[PDB]
Design a protein around this motif. Sequence first.
Motif, short mmCIF file in Angstrom:
data_model
loop_
_atom_site.label_atom_id
_atom_site.label_comp_id
_atom_site.label_asym_id
_atom_site.label_seq_id
_atom_site.Cartn_x
_atom_site.Cartn_y
_atom_site.Cartn_z
N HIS A 163 46.50 10.94 18.70
CA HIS A 163 45.93 10.80 20.02
C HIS A 163 46.83 11.51 21.03
N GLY A 219 46.80 11.80 24.44
CA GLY A 219 47.27 11.05 25.61
C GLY A 219 48.42 10.09 25.28
N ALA A 220 48.43 9.52 24.07
CA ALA A 220 49.53 8.65 23.66
C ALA A 220 50.79 9.43 23.40
N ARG A 267 52.62 10.16 26.53
CA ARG A 267 53.01 9.10 27.46
C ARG A 267 54.04 8.10 26.98
N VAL A 268 54.43 8.19 25.73
CA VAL A 268 54.93 7.06 25.03
C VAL A 268 55.81 7.61 23.94
N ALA A 276 57.64 3.46 27.43
CA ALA A 276 56.90 4.26 28.39
C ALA A 276 57.56 4.14 29.75
N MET A 277 57.23 5.05 30.66
CA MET A 277 57.81 5.04 31.97
C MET A 277 57.18 4.00 32.81
N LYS A 278 57.98 3.27 33.58
CA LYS A 278 57.44 2.35 34.55
C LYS A 278 56.42 3.07 35.44
N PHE A 308 60.40 1.25 30.01
CA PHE A 308 60.30 -0.12 29.60
C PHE A 308 59.67 -0.12 28.28
N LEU A 356 56.91 -1.59 25.90
CA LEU A 356 55.55 -2.14 26.00
C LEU A 356 55.45 -3.44 25.28
N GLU A 406 50.30 -4.61 22.74
CA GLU A 406 49.86 -3.32 23.25
C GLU A 406 50.55 -2.14 22.59
N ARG A 444 49.04 -1.50 19.14
CA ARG A 444 47.85 -0.66 19.19
C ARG A 444 48.24 0.79 19.37
N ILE A 445 49.12 1.09 20.32
CA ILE A 445 49.47 2.48 20.57
C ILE A 445 50.10 3.07 19.34
N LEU A 484 47.81 4.86 16.99
CA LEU A 484 47.22 6.10 17.37
C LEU A 484 48.18 7.23 17.10
N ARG A 528 41.65 0.25 18.96
CA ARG A 528 43.02 0.66 19.24
C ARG A 528 43.16 1.11 20.65
N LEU A 570 46.98 2.18 27.83
CA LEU A 570 47.54 3.51 27.67
C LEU A 570 47.32 4.46 28.85
N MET A 571 46.14 4.43 29.43
CA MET A 571 45.77 5.56 30.29
C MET A 571 46.22 5.31 31.68
N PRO A 619 52.15 6.50 33.09
CA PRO A 619 52.39 7.90 33.47
C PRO A 619 52.72 8.84 32.34
#
Lengths: 202, 64, 149, 116
Positions: free
Chosen positions: B6, B8-9, B12-13, B23-25, B47, B49, B53, B56-57, B60, C49, C59-60, C63
């Motif tokens: 994924h 976007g994940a 970001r992460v 992930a960033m605050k 921080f 997660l 949550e 789940r990430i 992906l 997920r 997730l979205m 940032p």
Amino acid sequence: VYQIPVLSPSGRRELAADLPAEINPHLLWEVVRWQLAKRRRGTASTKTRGEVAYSGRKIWPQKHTGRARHGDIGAPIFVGGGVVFGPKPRDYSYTLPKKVRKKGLAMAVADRAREGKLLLVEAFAGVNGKTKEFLAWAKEAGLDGSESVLLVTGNELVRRAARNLPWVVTLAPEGLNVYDIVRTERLVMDLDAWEVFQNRIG
Amino acid sequence: PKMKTHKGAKKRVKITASGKVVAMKTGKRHLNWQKSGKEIRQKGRKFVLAKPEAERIKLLLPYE
Amino acid sequence: MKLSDLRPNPGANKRRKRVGRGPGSGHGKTATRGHKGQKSRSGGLKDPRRFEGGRSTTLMRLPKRGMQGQVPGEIKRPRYQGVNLKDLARFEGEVTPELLVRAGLLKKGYRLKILGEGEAKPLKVVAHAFSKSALEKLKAAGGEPVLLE
Amino acid sequence: PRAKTGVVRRRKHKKILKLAKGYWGLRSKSFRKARETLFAAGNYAYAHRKRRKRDFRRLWIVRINAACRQHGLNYSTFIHGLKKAGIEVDRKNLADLAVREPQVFAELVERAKAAQ
RNA sequence: GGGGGGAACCUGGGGAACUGAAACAUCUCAGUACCCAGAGGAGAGGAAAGAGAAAUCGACUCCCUGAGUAGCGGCGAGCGA
RNA sequence: CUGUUGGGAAGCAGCGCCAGAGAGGGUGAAAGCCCCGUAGGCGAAAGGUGGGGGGAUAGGUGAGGGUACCCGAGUACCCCGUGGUUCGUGGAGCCAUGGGGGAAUCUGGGCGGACCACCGCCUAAGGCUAAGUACUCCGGGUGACCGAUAGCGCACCAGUACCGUGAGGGAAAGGUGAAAAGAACCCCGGGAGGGGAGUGAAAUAGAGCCUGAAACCGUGGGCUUACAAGCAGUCACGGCCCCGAGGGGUUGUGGCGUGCCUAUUGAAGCAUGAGCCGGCGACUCACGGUCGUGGGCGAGCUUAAGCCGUUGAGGCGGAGGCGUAGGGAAACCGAGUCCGAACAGGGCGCAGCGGCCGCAAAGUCCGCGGCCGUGGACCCGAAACCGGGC
RNA sequence: GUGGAGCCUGGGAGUGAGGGCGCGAGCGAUAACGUCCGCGUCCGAGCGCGGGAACAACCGAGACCGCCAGCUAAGGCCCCC
RNA sequence: GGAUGACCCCAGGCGGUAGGGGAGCGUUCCCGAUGCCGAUGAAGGCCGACCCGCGAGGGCGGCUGGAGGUAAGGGAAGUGC
RNA sequence: GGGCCUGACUGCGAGGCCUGCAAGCCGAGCAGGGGCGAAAGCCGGGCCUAGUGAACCGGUGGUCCCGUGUGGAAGGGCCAU
Ligand SMILES: [Mg+2]
Ligand SMILES: [Mg+2]
Ligand SMILES: [Mg+2]
Ligand SMILES: [Mg+2]
Ligand SMILES: [Mg+2]
Ligand SMILES: [Mg+2]
Ligand SMILES: [Mg+2]
Ligand SMILES: [Mg+2]
Ligand SMILES: [Mg+2]
Ligand SMILES: [Mg+2]
Ligand SMILES: [Mg+2]
Ligand SMILES: [Mg+2]
Ligand SMILES: [Mg+2]
Ligand SMILES: [Mg+2]
Ligand SMILES: [Mg+2]
Ligand SMILES: [Mg+2]
Ligand SMILES: [Mg+2]
Ligand SMILES: [Mg+2]
Ligand SMILES: [Mg+2]
Ligand SMILES: [Mg+2]
Ligand SMILES: [Mg+2]
Ligand SMILES: [Mg+2]
Ligand SMILES: [Mg+2]
Ligand SMILES: [Mg+2]
Ligand SMILES: [Mg+2]
Ligand SMILES: [Mg+2]
Ligand SMILES: [Mg+2]
Ligand SMILES: [Mg+2]
Ligand SMILES: [Mg+2]
Ligand SMILES: [Mg+2]
Ligand SMILES: [Mg+2]
Ligand SMILES: [Mg+2]
Ligand SMILES: [Mg+2]
Ligand SMILES: [Mg+2]
Ligand SMILES: [Mg+2]
Ligand SMILES: [Mg+2]
Ligand SMILES: [Mg+2]
Ligand SMILES: [Mg+2]
Ligand SMILES: [Mg+2]
Ligand SMILES: [Mg+2]
Ligand SMILES: [Mg+2]
Ligand SMILES: [Mg+2]
Ligand SMILES: [Mg+2]
Ligand SMILES: [Mg+2]
Ligand SMILES: [Mg+2]
Ligand SMILES: [Mg+2]
Ligand SMILES: [Mg+2]
Ligand SMILES: [Mg+2]
Ligand SMILES: [Mg+2]
Ligand SMILES: [Mg+2]
Ligand SMILES: [Mg+2]
Ligand SMILES: [Mg+2]
Ligand SMILES: [Mg+2]
Ligand SMILES: [Mg+2]
Ligand SMILES: [Mg+2]
Ligand SMILES: [Mg+2]
Ligand SMILES: [Mg+2]
Ligand SMILES: [Mg+2]
Ligand SMILES: [Mg+2]
Ligand SMILES: [Mg+2]
Ligand SMILES: [Mg+2]
Ligand SMILES: [Mg+2]
Ligand SMILES: [Mg+2]
Ligand SMILES: [Mg+2]
Ligand SMILES: [Mg+2]
Ligand SMILES: [Mg+2]
Ligand SMILES: [Mg+2]
Ligand SMILES: [Mg+2]
Ligand SMILES: [Mg+2]
Ligand SMILES: [Mg+2]
Ligand SMILES: [Mg+2]
Ligand SMILES: [Mg+2]
Ligand SMILES: [Mg+2]
Ligand SMILES: [Mg+2]
Ligand SMILES: [Mg+2]
Ligand SMILES: [Mg+2]
Ligand SMILES: [Mg+2]
Ligand SMILES: [Mg+2]
Ligand SMILES: [Mg+2]
Ligand SMILES: [Mg+2]
Ligand SMILES: [Mg+2]
Ligand SMILES: [Mg+2]
Ligand SMILES: [Mg+2]
Ligand SMILES: [Mg+2]
Ligand SMILES: [Mg+2]
Ligand SMILES: [Mg+2]
Ligand SMILES: [Mg+2]
Ligand SMILES: [Mg+2]
Ligand SMILES: [Mg+2]
Ligand SMILES: [Mg+2]
Ligand SMILES: [Mg+2]
Ligand SMILES: [Mg+2]
Ligand SMILES: [Mg+2]
Ligand SMILES: [Mg+2]
Ligand SMILES: [Mg+2]
Ligand SMILES: [Mg+2]
Ligand SMILES: [Mg+2]
Ligand SMILES: [Mg+2]
Ligand SMILES: [Mg+2]
Ligand SMILES: [Mg+2]
Ligand SMILES: [Mg+2]
Ligand SMILES: [Mg+2]
Ligand SMILES: [Mg+2]
Ligand SMILES: [Mg+2]
Ligand SMILES: [Mg+2]
Ligand SMILES: [Mg+2]
Ligand SMILES: [Mg+2]
Ligand SMILES: [Mg+2]
Ligand SMILES: [Mg+2]
Ligand SMILES: [Mg+2]
Ligand SMILES: [Mg+2]
Ligand SMILES: [Mg+2]
Ligand SMILES: [Mg+2]
Ligand SMILES: [Mg+2]
Ligand SMILES: [Mg+2]
Ligand SMILES: [Mg+2]
Ligand SMILES: [Mg+2]
Ligand SMILES: [Mg+2]
Ligand SMILES: [Mg+2]
Ligand SMILES: [Mg+2]
Ligand SMILES: [Mg+2]
Ligand SMILES: [Mg+2]
Ligand SMILES: [Mg+2]
Ligand SMILES: [Mg+2]
Ligand SMILES: [Mg+2]
Ligand SMILES: [Mg+2]
Ligand SMILES: [Mg+2]
Ligand SMILES: [Mg+2]
Ligand SMILES: [Mg+2]
Ligand SMILES: [Mg+2]
Ligand SMILES: [Mg+2]
Ligand SMILES: [Mg+2]
Ligand SMILES: [Mg+2]
Ligand SMILES: [Mg+2]
Ligand SMILES: [Mg+2]
Ligand SMILES: [Mg+2]
Ligand SMILES: [Mg+2]
Ligand SMILES: [Mg+2]
Ligand SMILES: [Mg+2]
Ligand SMILES: [Mg+2]
Ligand SMILES: [Mg+2]
Ligand SMILES: [Mg+2]
Ligand SMILES: [Mg+2]
Ligand SMILES: [Mg+2]
Ligand SMILES: [Mg+2]
Ligand SMILES: [Mg+2]
Ligand SMILES: [Mg+2]
Ligand SMILES: [Mg+2]
Ligand SMILES: [Mg+2]
Ligand SMILES: [Mg+2]
Ligand SMILES: [Mg+2]
Ligand SMILES: [Mg+2]
Ligand SMILES: [Mg+2]
Ligand SMILES: [Mg+2]
Ligand SMILES: [Mg+2]
Ligand SMILES: [Mg+2]
Ligand SMILES: [Mg+2]
Ligand SMILES: [Mg+2]
Ligand SMILES: [Mg+2]
Ligand SMILES: [Mg+2]
Ligand SMILES: [Mg+2]
Ligand SMILES: [Mg+2]
Ligand SMILES: [Mg+2]
Ligand SMILES: [Mg+2]
Ligand SMILES: [Mg+2]
Ligand SMILES: [Mg+2]
Ligand SMILES: [Mg+2]
Ligand SMILES: [Mg+2]
Ligand SMILES: [Mg+2]
Ligand SMILES: [Mg+2]
Ligand SMILES: [Mg+2]
Ligand SMILES: [Mg+2]
Ligand SMILES: [Mg+2]
Ligand SMILES: [Mg+2]
Ligand SMILES: [Mg+2]
Ligand SMILES: [Mg+2]
Ligand SMILES: [Mg+2]
Ligand SMILES: [Mg+2]
Ligand SMILES: [Mg+2]
Ligand SMILES: [Mg+2]
Ligand SMILES: [Mg+2]
Ligand SMILES: [Mg+2]
Ligand SMILES: [Mg+2]
Ligand SMILES: [Mg+2]
Ligand SMILES: [Mg+2]
Ligand SMILES: [Mg+2]
Ligand SMILES: [Mg+2]
Ligand SMILES: [Mg+2]
Ligand SMILES: [Mg+2]
Ligand SMILES: [Mg+2]
Ligand SMILES: [Mg+2]
Ligand SMILES: [Mg+2]
Ligand SMILES: [Mg+2]
Ligand SMILES: [Mg+2]
Ligand SMILES: [Mg+2]
Ligand SMILES: [Mg+2]
Ligand SMILES: [Mg+2]
Ligand SMILES: [Mg+2]
Ligand SMILES: [Mg+2]
Ligand SMILES: [Mg+2]
Ligand SMILES: [Mg+2]
Ligand SMILES: [Mg+2]
Ligand SMILES: [Mg+2]
Ligand SMILES: [Mg+2]
Ligand SMILES: [Mg+2]
Ligand SMILES: [Mg+2]
Ligand SMILES: [Mg+2]
Ligand SMILES: [Mg+2]
Ligand SMILES: [Mg+2]
Ligand SMILES: [Mg+2]
Ligand SMILES: [Mg+2]
Ligand SMILES: [Mg+2]
Ligand SMILES: [Mg+2]
Ligand SMILES: [Mg+2]
Ligand SMILES: [Mg+2]
Ligand SMILES: [Mg+2]
Ligand SMILES: [Mg+2]
Ligand SMILES: [Mg+2]
Ligand SMILES: [Mg+2]
Ligand SMILES: [Mg+2]
Ligand SMILES: [Mg+2]
Ligand SMILES: [Mg+2]
Ligand SMILES: [Mg+2]
Ligand SMILES: [Mg+2]
Ligand SMILES: [Mg+2]
Ligand SMILES: [Mg+2]
Ligand SMILES: [Mg+2]
Ligand SMILES: [Mg+2]
Ligand SMILES: [Mg+2]
Ligand SMILES: [Mg+2]
Ligand SMILES: [Mg+2]
Ligand SMILES: [Mg+2]
Ligand SMILES: [Mg+2]
Ligand SMILES: [Mg+2]
Ligand SMILES: [Mg+2]
Ligand SMILES: [Mg+2]
Ligand SMILES: [Mg+2]
Ligand SMILES: [Mg+2]
Ligand SMILES: [Mg+2]
Ligand SMILES: [Mg+2]
Ligand SMILES: [Mg+2]
Ligand SMILES: [Mg+2]
Ligand SMILES: [Mg+2]
Ligand SMILES: [Mg+2]
Ligand SMILES: [Mg+2]
Ligand SMILES: [Mg+2]
Ligand SMILES: [Mg+2]
Ligand SMILES: [Mg+2]
Ligand SMILES: [Mg+2]
Ligand SMILES: [Mg+2]
Ligand SMILES: [Mg+2]
Ligand SMILES: [Mg+2]
Ligand SMILES: [Mg+2]
Ligand SMILES: [Mg+2]
Ligand SMILES: [Mg+2]
Ligand SMILES: [Mg+2]
Ligand SMILES: [Mg+2]
Ligand SMILES: [Mg+2]
Ligand SMILES: [Mg+2]
Ligand SMILES: [Mg+2]
Ligand SMILES: [Mg+2]
Ligand SMILES: [Mg+2]
Ligand SMILES: [Mg+2]
Ligand SMILES: [Mg+2]
Ligand SMILES: [Mg+2]
Ligand SMILES: [Mg+2]
Ligand SMILES: [Mg+2]
Ligand SMILES: [Mg+2]
Ligand SMILES: [Mg+2]
Ligand SMILES: [Mg+2]
Ligand SMILES: [Mg+2]
Ligand SMILES: [Mg+2]
Ligand SMILES: [Mg+2]
Ligand SMILES: [Mg+2]
Ligand SMILES: [Mg+2]
Ligand SMILES: [Mg+2]
Ligand SMILES: [Mg+2]
Ligand SMILES: [Mg+2]
Ligand SMILES: [Mg+2]
Ligand SMILES: [Mg+2]
Ligand SMILES: [Mg+2]
Ligand SMILES: [Mg+2]
Ligand SMILES: [Mg+2]
Ligand SMILES: [Mg+2]
Ligand SMILES: [Mg+2]
Ligand SMILES: [Mg+2]
Ligand SMILES: [Mg+2]
Ligand SMILES: [Mg+2]
Ligand SMILES: [Mg+2]
Ligand SMILES: [Mg+2]
């Protein structure tokens, strides 16, 4: 570490072989499972409501006919219709770890060795491709055919001679495998056969 | 067919050595003029997660 | 030992779960699906997920961070892998990138960098880089650091 | 390979049908109505073997009472007297005596008045 | 010499929508379904005005891998060398 | 080969024999040796093929020096509009080209992701080119594939009957017996049908034919029933009938007693579904993932495609993948690293058991199971949308 | 206080229409088999059993199987019983 | 208790919808099988008041049927209305 | 009410409140450089609880981290807004 009868012109000498001390029946089972699965043809097939021959016309209207609703007659709910989740062509094989096969090959031979059922032989007397010839020799070597034998030798002449006997299964040494060893009561090898098997389990 | 990562994940992460998800605050993209310095500063860190949550990430990201 | 004896160990071959086959099984009728709604439907739910019922997802809302790359893609630059002194323990004489690949220590197509976890051993170690502490442990143990370029 | 129903379902249906022998019309004739009839029957049987225990005890009591009142007392008095006498003959038996052995029932009655 | 046929396969010229995006337009489905032309036992491609960082390789095609990588993306769903 | 049971031997029994052949199918049942085959061999005058062998033919082949003649044009190239690529206007190059403009011939030109320089790569605007690849109408081999509601729509005279103006839709329908020995003749009957006779091991194997379930219809028998109130049963007792200190059938009286499924807060419910019966009928498979689990090996584990072998034999193949180090947007450093002026603080990281032996283990491979993702993804059902035709 | 207690890590869910009753409120009219919260209970899933004439949720009581044995619970003891 | 899941003894739990988990039965097919059962009768059908099993089932017997069936232990699914 | 001032700090942050998540909230202490005070000490806006808006896309100042063979450049990252 095991002591293995060897048939010779000298007579019944012995030979020391290091074969596994312990047998892992599960692993032997895994090798046979693999052997038998990979020989599978995988040829059972069926047709889906999409692969069946009928048309996609909705047979009668959705409402007001007083009947149940249906779409086309290919649906699995119709006699004549397609089959749900039936078999499609399939590959049953998988790559059993090489070391497992190796360990398995060894253990199977080891198992026979431990039962006295493994016999090594120097060469085959008069067997020159005739069943009666092998049969003679066989008798003379303690194989009356009351026990099944996996005869392993690179000698084509000896294999033809023995292959028609109902109690004999024959193999080239490159072909040696655990289902065949386990299937038969007694293991008989050429020294040259035994040599490659040693090289194979190395 | 294989699972796809994924994107976007991935963007970001990050999955840490022990599999926490980081992930960033959130909250200092903008509208920052009246935020205190304690605020902007603290939102500048990563921080970890919350477990369900992150879990789940993590799924992906099948090949990190 | 014969074909009749070959058995998988207990637990090696578990039965599958079959649903929708009668009341005694305790998985009949609804087939453990509960009653009604999207998840009981053939096809079921959205990617649990990610999807969260329509609200912007966990997730979205976080940032994005850092350089994500641009067409025409990754910039080719030399890549380094570290192997520590302790992993060099097993060798005698010389270590070179190539040997380390074979040991299954260094991955192909990476340069060698020697790192400090462990003890140095008086070996001729040939690599593309050394850490400060690796060089130190290595010189001190009378080993020989050799830079490649 | 394919595993068609084959023999199996005919065989379940007969099992049920055979248990349903004797029932009225479709209830002994149609597997569906048979089975329905049978659920009912398993429950009644269960319930009724529970209550047979009651059905009989109430009967013994009616009898004992009739026998008591020939001797000028009632069941409640008779039972209390037996309790006090320490006589533990149960009702199945009190009732048999009351009919088959009246001389014995009489003596028990006696013991019961005396005991109070 | 052509014309017409051939179950799939093949190239070329055209080319949807449901659907997915839990609405929808970009996006997706998909250059798919389908129409058309053309071939043939295959067709296409093919002998660098290539690749792309190696002071390298050496036509094309096909399989494994590289890699769900690089990237692309209402940086969404997804797409993907 | 013989004996034996049997309608029939191939069963059982006795004594043999072949096997480079004990694959398989038949023969009155169950056959290596009866038949057809099988192993192993052999075979084309004619047509076709001929990627192998041989031969021929076309065709192929030099070195300095000078000259600066030629080296694919509405082309490159630039701009506009677009397509292709992973690239959706993006810093957008490349390849292609509908419009406009528009060169040069090696001191020429295109390219290496805007552009410029440098350093390199390559020679556009003509054409052909085996093989390795795709497919399966056709022939053959083989199935932990179907077995007449299955398997193709079709085992059968089926793309038929039938339906539709048409495009188009589209069925049902297999089995006497070893052998027809397929029932001469007589009897009743117009016939059909039957009753004898006959055939057969068997004829409720008689052609409306193997088996012959169930719903459904009947004949005969046992028990029962016309003052009785019912989800049809159940428990108890008694009567009668049957098989023989027990059972079975039946049911008079007495007690108790609101079908099944579905959906619901809640159904006997006057809420859904079902006339009854038989058959068909719905949680799978691939690839990825995640956990669990059975094993193998363990700082390592593992191969993919392919190749060799086999013809229900396995092996080779290390390319690659996961693991062995993390931290950081990155440069980068590294048992650390990031923020920071910080040797501050913090985030995220780093550190087996027994007697060198064995044991366990990171991890990883394979199997099995649960669940997840992608697929139509548990089955059935729209109204609709789109393409091409009629 | 050793319980189908508790805590931790992980795998699999289903549920996210509740309902009656008691008590505390709001809304309603010091109406509703009304509505909306709180504490509790039961039905849900205990339409299994006794009582309440009958009757999911009132009283009694948590049905592993069998008995032609005993004691009780609520409720009952004139006949139906 | 005995050593180990042999079985005995004592105690306690055992209502149940969604749903989690466990242990089994049976259907088709494969290895077991060039074997074994089978015309002195395969499968299938119809009876059974008998045996085993909590149960799903499995035996045994009689009749029908007339040529197939298939163990212990494992394997795989078009597996139960 | 007045005087001096800019702590309406920069780098962090033990430990908590709250809480499904994400948010929200309080915060001693250490370092840098300051303000006020003789000092003790206080000061990381306002007696407090509302005065607000995740992510995506983009702007501007800074940094000088990446820069598609190489040096630049394009474009991005990072800090601030
Ligand atoms: Mg197969
Ligand atoms: Mg198959
Ligand atoms: Mg098919
Ligand atoms: Mg089919
Ligand atoms: Mg269909
Ligand atoms: Mg169709
Ligand atoms: Mg079709
Ligand atoms: Mg058709
Ligand atoms: Mg069709
Ligand atoms: Mg259609
Ligand atoms: Mg149609
Ligand atoms: Mg249609
Ligand atoms: Mg309707
Ligand atoms: Mg109707
Ligand atoms: Mg109807
Ligand atoms: Mg209908
Ligand atoms: Mg309809
Ligand atoms: Mg339909
Ligand atoms: Mg339809
Ligand atoms: Mg259809
Ligand atoms: Mg079909
Ligand atoms: Mg059909
Ligand atoms: Mg069909
Ligand atoms: Mg079907
Ligand atoms: Mg399906
Ligand atoms: Mg289907
Ligand atoms: Mg499937
Ligand atoms: Mg296949
Ligand atoms: Mg599998
Ligand atoms: Mg494979
Ligand atoms: Mg043989
Ligand atoms: Mg055998
Ligand atoms: Mg922010
Ligand atoms: Mg924002
Ligand atoms: Mg910002
Ligand atoms: Mg910004
Ligand atoms: Mg403020
Ligand atoms: Mg705020
Ligand atoms: Mg502040
Ligand atoms: Mg990877
Ligand atoms: Mg990792
Ligand atoms: Mg399985
Ligand atoms: Mg069941
Ligand atoms: Mg369960
Ligand atoms: Mg349940
Ligand atoms: Mg149901
Ligand atoms: Mg459902
Ligand atoms: Mg479930
Ligand atoms: Mg589920
Ligand atoms: Mg449901
Ligand atoms: Mg629900
Ligand atoms: Mg339902
Ligand atoms: Mg619901
Ligand atoms: Mg629903
Ligand atoms: Mg649900
Ligand atoms: Mg549904
Ligand atoms: Mg569907
Ligand atoms: Mg859906
Ligand atoms: Mg919204
Ligand atoms: Mg990246
Ligand atoms: Mg040295
Ligand atoms: Mg079925
Ligand atoms: Mg069937
Ligand atoms: Mg049946
Ligand atoms: Mg049934
Ligand atoms: Mg039957
Ligand atoms: Mg049955
Ligand atoms: Mg009756
Ligand atoms: Mg009847
Ligand atoms: Mg009837
Ligand atoms: Mg009937
Ligand atoms: Mg029953
Ligand atoms: Mg009972
Ligand atoms: Mg009862
Ligand atoms: Mg009682
Ligand atoms: Mg009196
Ligand atoms: Mg008393
Ligand atoms: Mg008493
Ligand atoms: Mg033409
Ligand atoms: Mg043509
Ligand atoms: Mg095209
Ligand atoms: Mg054209
Ligand atoms: Mg086109
Ligand atoms: Mg096309
Ligand atoms: Mg169009
Ligand atoms: Mg659309
Ligand atoms: Mg669709
Ligand atoms: Mg989707
Ligand atoms: Mg949509
Ligand atoms: Mg939608
Ligand atoms: Mg709409
Ligand atoms: Mg759309
Ligand atoms: Mg789709
Ligand atoms: Mg597309
Ligand atoms: Mg097509
Ligand atoms: Mg043509
Ligand atoms: Mg070819
Ligand atoms: Mg070609
Ligand atoms: Mg060509
Ligand atoms: Mg050329
Ligand atoms: Mg990789
Ligand atoms: Mg994104
Ligand atoms: Mg596309
Ligand atoms: Mg005879
Ligand atoms: Mg004979
Ligand atoms: Mg014999
Ligand atoms: Mg053979
Ligand atoms: Mg044979
Ligand atoms: Mg045969
Ligand atoms: Mg016969
Ligand atoms: Mg035989
Ligand atoms: Mg046979
Ligand atoms: Mg034969
Ligand atoms: Mg041959
Ligand atoms: Mg031949
Ligand atoms: Mg010259
Ligand atoms: Mg010139
Ligand atoms: Mg040129
Ligand atoms: Mg020209
Ligand atoms: Mg252009
Ligand atoms: Mg494009
Ligand atoms: Mg962009
Ligand atoms: Mg571009
Ligand atoms: Mg042009
Ligand atoms: Mg030049
Ligand atoms: Mg030039
Ligand atoms: Mg160009
Ligand atoms: Mg250009
Ligand atoms: Mg350029
Ligand atoms: Mg280039
Ligand atoms: Mg080039
Ligand atoms: Mg060409
Ligand atoms: Mg060639
Ligand atoms: Mg080719
Ligand atoms: Mg082919
Ligand atoms: Mg064929
Ligand atoms: Mg079959
Ligand atoms: Mg068959
Ligand atoms: Mg049929
Ligand atoms: Mg058919
Ligand atoms: Mg049939
Ligand atoms: Mg056909
Ligand atoms: Mg048909
Ligand atoms: Mg016809
Ligand atoms: Mg019409
Ligand atoms: Mg017509
Ligand atoms: Mg039609
Ligand atoms: Mg039909
Ligand atoms: Mg016949
Ligand atoms: Mg015939
Ligand atoms: Mg006549
Ligand atoms: Mg006449
Ligand atoms: Mg006649
Ligand atoms: Mg007659
Ligand atoms: Mg006649
Ligand atoms: Mg006769
Ligand atoms: Mg006979
Ligand atoms: Mg008969
Ligand atoms: Mg017959
Ligand atoms: Mg008939
Ligand atoms: Mg027959
Ligand atoms: Mg018949
Ligand atoms: Mg008949
Ligand atoms: Mg009948
Ligand atoms: Mg009658
Ligand atoms: Mg009257
Ligand atoms: Mg009467
Ligand atoms: Mg009654
Ligand atoms: Mg009585
Ligand atoms: Mg009786
Ligand atoms: Mg009776
Ligand atoms: Mg009775
Ligand atoms: Mg009574
Ligand atoms: Mg009722
Ligand atoms: Mg009721
Ligand atoms: Mg039912
Ligand atoms: Mg229903
Ligand atoms: Mg409803
Ligand atoms: Mg309703
Ligand atoms: Mg309602
Ligand atoms: Mg009713
Ligand atoms: Mg009513
Ligand atoms: Mg009614
Ligand atoms: Mg209604
Ligand atoms: Mg109703
Ligand atoms: Mg409804
Ligand atoms: Mg009807
Ligand atoms: Mg009926
Ligand atoms: Mg049925
Ligand atoms: Mg499943
Ligand atoms: Mg799994
Ligand atoms: Mg595993
Ligand atoms: Mg291994
Ligand atoms: Mg180990
Ligand atoms: Mg991977
Ligand atoms: Mg630190
Ligand atoms: Mg720390
Ligand atoms: Mg392991
Ligand atoms: Mg899951
Ligand atoms: Mg699909
Ligand atoms: Mg599906
Ligand atoms: Mg699924
Ligand atoms: Mg549909
Ligand atoms: Mg319409
Ligand atoms: Mg529309
Ligand atoms: Mg429209
Ligand atoms: Mg149209
Ligand atoms: Mg049209
Ligand atoms: Mg405990
Ligand atoms: Mg509990
Ligand atoms: Mg609990
Ligand atoms: Mg849990
Ligand atoms: Mg589960
Ligand atoms: Mg849920
Ligand atoms: Mg729910
Ligand atoms: Mg809701
Ligand atoms: Mg509600
Ligand atoms: Mg409520
Ligand atoms: Mg509640
Ligand atoms: Mg409510
Ligand atoms: Mg309340
Ligand atoms: Mg009160
Ligand atoms: Mg109140
Ligand atoms: Mg209130
Ligand atoms: Mg009033
Ligand atoms: Mg009420
Ligand atoms: Mg209410
Ligand atoms: Mg009220
Ligand atoms: Mg009220
Ligand atoms: Mg309540
Ligand atoms: Mg409910
Ligand atoms: Mg209750
Ligand atoms: Mg309860
Ligand atoms: Mg109740
Ligand atoms: Mg009741
Ligand atoms: Mg109940
Ligand atoms: Mg009650
Ligand atoms: Mg009551
Ligand atoms: Mg009552
Ligand atoms: Mg007893
Ligand atoms: Mg008492
Ligand atoms: Mg009382
Ligand atoms: Mg009363
Ligand atoms: Mg009365
Ligand atoms: Mg107990
Ligand atoms: Mg328990
Ligand atoms: Mg209990
Ligand atoms: Mg229970
Ligand atoms: Mg359990
Ligand atoms: Mg289970
Ligand atoms: Mg069994
Ligand atoms: Mg079954
Ligand atoms: Mg089973
Ligand atoms: Mg098969
Ligand atoms: Mg066999
Ligand atoms: Mg057999
Ligand atoms: Mg026999
Ligand atoms: Mg016979
Ligand atoms: Mg018989
Ligand atoms: Mg069968
Ligand atoms: Mg059978
Ligand atoms: Mg039975
Ligand atoms: Mg039979
Ligand atoms: Mg046969
Ligand atoms: Mg079998
Ligand atoms: Mg078996
Ligand atoms: Mg096996
Ligand atoms: Mg099925
Ligand atoms: Mg001053
Ligand atoms: Mg904290
Ligand atoms: Mg929090
Ligand atoms: Mg100060
Ligand atoms: Mg200070
Ligand atoms: Mg001062
Ligand atoms: Mg402070
Ligand atoms: Mg203020
Ligand atoms: Mg304020
Ligand atoms: Mg967006
Ligand atoms: Mg958005
Ligand atoms: Mg931005
Ligand atoms: Mg550059
Ligand atoms: Mg730089
Ligand atoms: Mg460049
Ligand atoms: Mg320069
Ligand atoms: Mg530079
Ligand atoms: Mg400059
Ligand atoms: Mg810049
Ligand atoms: Mg910048
Ligand atoms: Mg920032
Ligand atoms: Mg800062």
